[PDB]
Design a protein around this ligand. Structure first.
Ligand SMILES: [Zn+2]
Ligand SMILES: [Zn+2]
Lengths: 30, 21, 30, 21, 30, 30, 21, 21, 30, 30, 21, 21
């Protein structure tokens, strides 16, 4: 695999693919 | 955090995996 | 009006849109 | 869970907010 | 709901979700 | 070659690609 | 409408231009 | 317009709703 | 058709739509 | 854990994520 | 091909790397 | 190449078509 530059919704898409049925948490800094 | 790192720098799929449930 | 089905990556795109900075969890096994 | 409510069945954007942190 | 920063096709995706079966018009400045 | 099906958000992504600055309307009830 | 032409049936990118303004 | 505002500044889902048919 | 400004995964989406069943090659500079 | 189905644009989004700079080919007729 | 492996059937992200150049 | 041109400048769908198989 390669490193990736992911902003906005693209990060969410990547988490979805990496985690699959495990699901994930999306937690940006506030 | 990971959201900021991936956008301002780069991140790996292995780092992302730590956010899976 | 009536709602549509949101599945997979489309569902997490919708969670990103609705939640944004608040963050969210996508836990399909739940 | 969210899949049953929003993918298998249907849900509003208001219901989607139930899964925000 | 939260405010969002939407450029390009991401705006189209957001309109799609907000409007559902109502549909929408996408009208950028020319 | 023969064409594929474009539905939902994929259909409006395709309208964004083909129309761009011209803008477009997505009216599924029509 | 567009859904019947392009989702239920299939359409070319040229046909999609019919829905541009 | 809304396309430019959402990109150069921020916009709400309620502002977007005004573009629904 | 109109000209488009496509970066990252958006370019991949555009190739997918343009090429259809023909498929395509994605080849960035290294 | 078990894997999900990746089709169409979702499949090439996944190829973009996994391959990135290396590039990839999407050849559905193969 | 990739469609049969990953869309019709299922594949891992490791298997997807088979289609990288 | 095409990946860079589309991002740093603009590109047409006809230019993209040259990358189809
Ligand atoms: Zn983007
Ligand atoms: Zn889809």
């Amino acid at each position: 695999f390669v490193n990736q530059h992911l902003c906005g919704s693209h990060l969410v898409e990547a988490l979805y693919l990496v985690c699959g049925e495990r699901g994930f948490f999306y937690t940006p800094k506030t | 955090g990971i959201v900021e790192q991936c956008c301002t720098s780069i991140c790996s799929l292995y780092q992302l995996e730590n956010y899976c449930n």
